[PDB]
Amino acid sequence: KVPPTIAQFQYTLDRNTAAETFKLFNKYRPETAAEKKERLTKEAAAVAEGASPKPYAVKYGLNHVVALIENKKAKLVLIANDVDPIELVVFLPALCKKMGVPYAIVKGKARLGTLVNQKTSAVAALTEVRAEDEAALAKLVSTIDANFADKYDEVKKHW
Amino acid sequence: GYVVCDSDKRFLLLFSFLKRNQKKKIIVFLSSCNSVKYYAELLNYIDLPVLELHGKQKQQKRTNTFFEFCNAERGILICTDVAARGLDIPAVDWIIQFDPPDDPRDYIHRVGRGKSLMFLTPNPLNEYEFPENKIANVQSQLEKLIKSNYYLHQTAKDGYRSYLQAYASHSLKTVYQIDKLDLAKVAKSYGFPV
Amino acid sequence: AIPRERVIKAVNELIKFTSKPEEELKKDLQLIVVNNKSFTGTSKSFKLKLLNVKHSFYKPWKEASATAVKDFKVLLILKDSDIKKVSEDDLFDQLDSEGIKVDEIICGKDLKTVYKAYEARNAFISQFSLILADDSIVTSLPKLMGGKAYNKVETTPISIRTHANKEFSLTTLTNNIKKVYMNQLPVKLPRGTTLNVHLGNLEWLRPEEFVDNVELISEQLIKAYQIRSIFIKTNRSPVLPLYYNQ
Amino acid sequence: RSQSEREEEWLEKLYKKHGDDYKKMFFDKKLNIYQQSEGDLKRRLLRWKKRNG
Amino acid sequence: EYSGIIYVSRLPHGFHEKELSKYFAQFGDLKEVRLARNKKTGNSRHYGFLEFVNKEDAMIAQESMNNYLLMGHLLQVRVLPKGAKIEKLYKYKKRKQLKDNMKQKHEERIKKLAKS
Amino acid sequence: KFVRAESIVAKTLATSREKERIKRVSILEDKKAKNETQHIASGKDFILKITEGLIREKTTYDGKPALLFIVRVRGPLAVNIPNKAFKILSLLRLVETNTGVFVKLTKNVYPLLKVIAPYVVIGKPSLSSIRSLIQKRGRIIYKGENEAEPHEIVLNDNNIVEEQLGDHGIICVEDIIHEIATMGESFSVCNFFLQPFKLNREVSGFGSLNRLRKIKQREAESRTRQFSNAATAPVIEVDIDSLLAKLN
Amino acid sequence: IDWFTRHEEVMPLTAVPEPKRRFVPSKNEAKRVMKIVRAIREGRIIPPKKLKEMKEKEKIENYQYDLWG
RNA sequence: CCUUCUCAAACAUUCUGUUUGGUAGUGAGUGAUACUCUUUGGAGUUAACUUGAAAUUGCCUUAAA
């Protein structure tokens, strides 16, 4: 028997919505260690001989995400269900519901790791966005709130 | 006498009434001397030549520059209720008070020397109309601008922290903290109310 | 050719009709309605006839937009080759020497990725007033910037020659943008018989200068088109018969 | 204690553009990228005016 | 209770009766489908009705497509109450004798400035 | 098997570009041939070449008959070809992807050439590329033992060359190459004699390198082939010679 | 019963000022470049354009040497 | 999960002018008197404004498994 705050997970986001979430999220990769290093050597070769705006990426640290929700800066928050200590993330759907930040439980922790240059991530969030994907993001917010939140209003109940 | 408006577009309406009225000596009255740092700093940076009076500056710095308005013909100053008290210029036509004043009782008495309107969601003369789709669409310009400089972000913040304190430190039973903070942050244009 | 004196008796009696004890457009908008035996009846064009005008109504429109609520703003749509090539500082350096000012230059890319939403596109387009467009992409625009943006006469773009015989040059655009700005007036071409020429701001056009603009237009219409009837009209006034062809 | 090559060359850009208008200099975006205060920019310009003109 | 006619709404631009009939054939046998179009130009107003022959099969679709995100915007879909049939969505597509009167009309018009 | 709703709209909206794309071209060259210029885009024949920094030398097209080799490509993404392009690709029998044919370019051929431009790649080949194509790939639909003709098999012989054509002076396989590289009168007969050229595909597999080499090469098509979609779109020419090294 | 979270939150849970480091382009990468500037000033590191030039002269000269004598 | 007609000509050159041609739209809704037309059927038109991309029915195959 599962106490309602556990198994608020497993009632995860479905097939098509999850695919569309990654269609958005895979656009916003953090610049990998190799890519970042080569860019700075390009900067070294250029600026030593002879401007840029703030670049948007996903935010992916548990401490960083728990900061961003309640900041409030997070817009979408993805949460993996499979976590070795489950108690690490059990409060997080409640925190998002309380602060009114739209969240989604995604399926697979390594699935979050792929979009983020890590092995696993447990939580991923998209704070800010480029102007072109703004309408698409807000549409996905409504899509997730209709599919995830409104269908499973009774997820806080039932063992 | 007044103009009924919601807290989102209170500032956005004001910027309309200033741009349409760019010849007359007009005065705004705002609460905090901290706040009129903010609304002065926007308008010189969204390019309206405004003037600024508040407690947070020196005396003859305040005075000699207030003196520039009194001998002027066209422009506009932003001042507090308090620092402009006792020093009315007869050369004025519009006194728009954005806030509920410091003393609401004695406020009507300081009129009669200057046309008046105020701004209130729930809270002699008549009102005015306003065609609602005429307000300037600068909120797109401002939200980028409130995120880009940090000085303008700080002065937006103090213009918000000090706005509501003064709103709570007031007399009336009407003007007491009922107003939702989702929209007063939009009067200073945030995504989230600080 | 039309007499100068009927137009003076046309304009000043409308100065009467505008001096009476929405209002931003009804008082201000000098327009003149032109009729034809079938303007361009069978093909739905979107070109703007750049009627040569002696004295601008845009340097006029420059000022009163600062005193009125809406900012008059100028757009340039370019292809990919030029935006990577040219900044606004080069425009500003050679157009503020007159005093005209391109606010935003916009790629063809930006119409389809960062304003592709219908809401944000209406937010972006409806701000601006002088929509200019470089010729390579002028013919691609009603897929890009929507059909709603072609209902007006402001927001419909203007094709402008930027290539100095097959290759782009900044010199070519810089004197050509002045050419359209201060000397030219648009008018569209519906496939109906009715056409108006929104001549511009009634607060401007000192009405001896205004008659100079009206008569000069009637030259470039009767030569280029057969026409039936010509009317001046402040916005839903009684219509005034100025010229009467048969 | 002196100032770096980039810092000096960056201060040359500011001085030749504005002169001694520190308000304009800190509200500038293109040359003053790191949004430093009036007091920071003027102090560094005083040190620059000692080594140079 | 619930009936057989469906209210597929909020349709993507470029998604017509054929593809409405094709995709919703996958659920079972479908009775009849239209899509509401503008009369003047043959384009869609982005809501359309179809019916399955099985009233079981209807709320299969509604419990599968009520918020189904589809290339820009999620489809809102509704089963309908009893009766209330599909009606009237026609498939629209992109569809000196004079000089006497104008001489009359030129002189009639001058009275209007005298009117005001 | 089941169809996702993503597919049928993407297929709808892409072909209903191509249904709109060739319609405009079919209206245009009608008005170019029938010569009713009151409102046209352009008034001549355009052939552009794209080679290597990534040069785009747009040219005119005179009436001079040239030789073009055309390879079937499989583009674009969601495009069921319409009836008007089923035909030309069937009359050139290019219905299989990665299959080629030589044709002659006239001013009768060029207007139909703007129809099939997004579906193939075209170009002028070289004599080596003429020769090394034929003596390395060549099919002959000819009679088998008694019954089974349609074994297309191989340009094995020079006396099968004597068999079918023969009497046009067509004596050897090298002599065929004279009839293609030079515009001969019996060029169409020998063109009707060598029906496909089953070129290989470049990537040709799944795997470690193969997934990557597919991705790295797939973007290379997006530069060396642009899809104009214009009324007076140019016809785009690529170098065949560098392409056949990738395809032989 | 999701009792406390039904009353949805308004101001963030802190009031901390946000530093100037979250606006002007970042010191860290700016420090890191300056170090890579320093290393090429000392020449410990080659720029990537010359490394292609190190690989252009190399890697064509393959199988082009005597092996018996 | 497609991504959209990125310039033609002619004459004259100042290091670019002049002239001509080329654009067939998300939907819904509000709404300012005038224009034409034929025929009472309405057709083509002419300011302006709203809106999350809104909505409840006008008579080819290696982008395989």
Beta strand A123-126 with A76-80 is antiparallel
Phi, psi at residue B47, to the nearest 5°? 60, 60
CB A65 within 8 A of CB A125: yes
From F190, F137, F120, select the one nearest F160 (Cα to Cα).
F190
Burial grade of B40 (CB within 10 A; 0-12, 13-18, 19 or more): buried
Question: Two tokens at B82?
Answer: 């308090």
Amino acid at position G3, single letter: W
A14, A15, A16, A76, best to mutate vs chain E, most E CBs in 10 Å: A16
The DSSP result for F206-245, as a single string, is -SHHHHHHHHHHHHHHHHH------TTPPEEE--HHHHHH
Measured distance between the N- and C-terminal CA atoms of chain C, rounded to whole angstroms? 14
CA F107, F112, F117, F123 dihedral sign is negative
Q: Which residue is listed with tokens 């790939």? A: F137
At residue B132's C-alpha, the angle toward residues B128 and B135, to 5°, is 100
Residues in a beta bridge with B28: B78, B96
Are A132 and C114 within 8 A, CB to CB?
Answer: yes
With beta carbons less than 8 A apart as the criterion, state whether C89 and D30 touch.
no
d(C-alpha A44, C-alpha G51), whole Å: 15
Nearest 5°: phi and psi at F121? -125, 140
β-pairing verdict for E47-52 and B76-80: unpaired
Pairing of strands C240-244, E2-9: unpaired
Q: What is the dihedral of CA F85, F88, F93, F96, to 10 degrees?
A: -20
What technique was this entry resolved by? cryo-EM
Can you tell me the distance from the alpha carbon of A109 to that of C226, in angstroms, rounded to the nearest whole number? 74
Q: Which two tokens stand for residue G16?
A: 């901390």
CB-based contact (8 Å) between C127 and chain B? yes
- Asked whether A124 and A25 are in contact (CB, 8 A), the reply is yes
Strand H: which bases are under 7 Å from protein Cβ?
A: 1-9, 15-28, 32-38, 44-63
**Which chain A positions have a beta carbon within 8 Å of E68's beta carbon?**
16
Strands C229-234, C29-35: pairing kind: antiparallel
Using alpha carbons only, what angle is made at residue F123 by residues F117 and F127, rounded to the nearest 5 degrees?
Answer: 155
Contact of F236 with F224, CB cutoff 8 Å: no
Q: Do C113 and A134 touch (CB under 8 A)?
A: no
Q: For residues A37 and C161, what is the distance between their CA atoms, to the nearest angstrom?
A: 44
- Name the minimum distance, in Å, from the CA of A78 to any CA of chain C: 25
Closest CA relative to residue F77, chosen from F218, F241, F236: F218
Q: Decide: helix, strand or coil at residue G60.
A: coil
* CA atoms of A79 and A101, how far apart (whole Å): 13
Rounded Cα–Cα distance for residues B25 and B15 (Å):
15
Instruction: Tell how far CA A126 is from the center of its chain.
Output: 6
For F41-75, letters b (16+ CB in 10 Å) and e give eeeebbbbbbeeeeeeeeeebeeeeebbbbbbbee
Q: Which domain holds residue A99?
A: 1-159
C230 → chain E, closest CA residue: E106
> Which residues on chain C are in Cβ contact (under 8 Å) with B20?
67-69
The C-alpha atoms of residue B31 and residue B162 are separated, in whole angstroms, by 9
Is residue A44 classed as helix, strand or coil in its secondary structure? helix
What's the CA gap between F241 and A65, in Å, rounded?
Answer: 56
d(CA C235, CA F75): 54
**Is the CB of residue B188 less than 8 Å from the CB of residue B11?**
yes
CB F180 within 8 A of CB F133: no
Distance CA F193, CA F215 (A): 37
For CA atoms F156, F158, F164, F168, give the dihedral sign: positive
Checking B122-125 for CB contacts under 8 A at 24+ apart, the result is B122/B174, B122/B178, B122/B179, B123/B174, B123/B175, B124/B1, B125/B1, B125/B2
**CA–CA dist F70, F102 (Å, integer):** 6
Phi, psi of F69 (to 5 degrees): -110, 130
Among C196, C84, C82, C93, which Cα is nearest to C132's?
Answer: C82
Strand partners, E81: E2
Q: Which residue, counting CA atoms, is nearest to the C1' of nucleotide H56?
A: E7
CB-based contacts of F35-43 (< 8 A; 24+ apart in sequence): F39/C43, F40/F232, F41/C139, F41/F230, F41/F231, F41/F232, F42/F232
Compute the half-sphere exposure of residue C215: CA atoms within 13 Å on the CB side of its CA. Answer: 16
Contact (CB, 8 A) for F244 and F125:
yes
Residue holding tokens 């001694």? D20
CB C209 within 8 A of CB C55: yes
Measured between CB atoms, which of G2, G32, G39 is closest to A97?
Answer: G2
Are B36 and B12 within 8 A, CB to CB? no
Helix %, strand %, coil % of chain A (to 5) = 45, 10, 45
Rounded to whole angstroms, the Cα distance separating F40 from F29 reads 10
- Give strand pairing partners of F50: F56
Q: What residue has token string 């700005």?
A: C181
If one counts the domains in chain A, the total is: 1
Q: From residue E68, give the alpha-carbon distance in Å to each of A134, A143, B120, E16.
A: 20, 8, 43, 17
Answer yes or no: is F43 CB < 7 A from strand H. Answer: yes
CB A8 within 8 A of CB A93: yes
DSSP strands (E only) in A25-132: 76-80, 103-106, 123-126
Are the CB atoms for C103 and C132 separated by under 8 Å?
A: no
State how far the Cα of D14 lies from the Cα of B19, in Å rounded to an integer. Answer: 33
How is the beta sheet containing F120-121 ordered, strand by strand?
A: F100-105, F66-72, F120-121
What are the backbone dihedrals phi and psi of residue E33, each rounded to the nearest 5 degrees, phi first? -135, 140
- Measured CA to CA, the distance from residue E103 to residue F4 in angstroms comes to 66
Is the C-beta of residue F219 closer than 7 Å to nucleic acid chain H? no
Q: Is A127 strand, coil or helix?
A: coil
C145 CA, H20 C1': separation in Å? 26
| A159 close to G3: Cβ distance less than 8 angstroms | no
At residue B142, the 3 state secondary structure works out as: helix
Element (H, E) at F50: strand F46-51
Would the CA dihedral through C122, C128, C131, C136 be positive or negative?
Answer: negative
CATH of the domain at A108: 3.30.1330.30
Resolution in A: 3.2
**Is the N-terminal amide bond of F76 cis, ω within 30° of 0?**
yes
Q: Side chain identity at F58, as an amino acid letter?
A: K
Residues of chain E with Cβ-Cβ distance to C228 below 8 Å are 102
The three-state secondary structure class of B3 is strand
Give me F19's structure tokens: 């249904």
d(CA F99, CA F104): 17
Provide the β-strand partners of residue B127.
B2
Strand-pairing partners, residue F69, are F102
**In contact, C88 and C142? CB cutoff 8 Å:** no
* Other CB atoms within 10 A of residue B44 CB: 14
- Collect all residues with Cβ–Cβ distance below 8 Å to F154 and sequence separation of at least 6: F138, F139, F140
- Is residue C212 classed as helix, strand or coil in its secondary structure? helix
Chain G residues with at least one Cβ partner in B under 8 Å: 10-12, 15, 17-18, 20, 22-24
Look at the block and give the residue holding tokens 């935003």: C104
What does the alpha-carbon distance between residue C241 and residue G60 come to, in Å, rounded to a whole number? 85
Q: Tell me which H or E stretch contains C197.
A: strand C194-201
Element (H, E) at F55: strand F55-60
Single-letter residue type at D45: L
Q: How many secondary structure helices (H) and strands (E) does chain B include?
A: 6, 5
Residues 223-242 of C with CB under 7 A from strand H: 224, 228-229, 231, 233, 235-239
Quick one: tokens of C171? 């010199």
Q: Where do the H-state alpha helices sit in chain F?
A: 5-33, 83-91, 109-113, 127-134, 160-163, 173-181, 187-191, 208-224, 240-247
Contact D35 B149 (CB under 8 A): yes
Interchain contact F8–E (C-beta under 8 A) = yes
Are C233 and C31 in contact by the 8 Å Cβ rule? The answer is yes
**Contact (CB, 8 A) for A146 and E74:** yes
Instruction: Record the tokens describing residue E36, joined without a space.
Output: 């509401």
Smallest Cα–Cα separation from D38: which of B151, B60, B55? B151
Bridging pattern class, strands C51-52 and C229-234: unpaired
Cα separation, C214 vs C2, in Å, equals: 9
Q: Distance between alpha carbon F83 and the CA centroid of its chain, in Å?
A: 18
How many residues can be counted in chain D? Answer: 53
Cβ(C221)–Cβ(C34) below 8 Å = yes
Q: Do C148 and C12 meet the contact criterion of CB atoms below 8 Å apart?
A: no
For residues C149-159, b (16+ Cβ closer than 10 Å) or e, as one string? bbeeeebbbbb
| Chain gaps in chain B, named by the residue before each (C–N > 2.5 Å) | 113, 123
User: In this structure, what DSSP letter does residue G55 have?
Assistant: H
Rounded Cα–Cα distance for residues F234 and F228 (Å): 7
Would you state the structure tokens that stand for residue F161, as one six-digit string?
Answer: 């060359």
- Pairing state between β B50-52 and B76-80: parallel
Dist. CA C232–CA C72, nearest whole Å: 25
The token pair at F174 is 């090298």
In angstroms, the CA A101 to CA E104 distance is 71
CB atoms within 10 A of CB G11: 13
Residue among C177, C172, C147, C174 at smallest CA distance from C162: C172
Residue C189: both structure tokens together: 């071409």
In the 3-class helix/strand/coil scheme, how is C85-141 assigned residue by residue? CCCHHHHHHHHCCCCCCCCEEECCCHHHHCCCCHHHHHHHHCCCCEEEEEHHHHCCH
- From chain A, pick out residues whose CB is under 8 angstroms from the CB of G39: 44
Which of D34, D36, D37, D41 is best to mutate for the G interface (most G CBs within 10 A)?
A: D34
Yes or no: say if C46 and C235 are a contact pair by the CB < 8 Å rule: no
DSSP, collapsed to helix, strand or coil, labels residue A78 as strand
Instruction: Give the span between the Cα atoms of G25 and G30, in whole angstroms.
Output: 8
Kindly state the greatest CA–CA separation across chain D: 29
Ordered DSSP codes for G14-54: --PPPPGGGTSPPHHHHHHHHHHHHHHHTTSS--HHHHHHH
Question: What is the SS3 assignment for chain E?
Answer: CEEEEEEEECCCCCCCHHHHHHHCCCCCCEEEECCCECCCCCCECCEEEEEECCHHHHHHHHHHHCCECCCCCCEEEEEEECCCCCCCCCCCCCCCHHHHHHHHHHHHHCHHHHHC
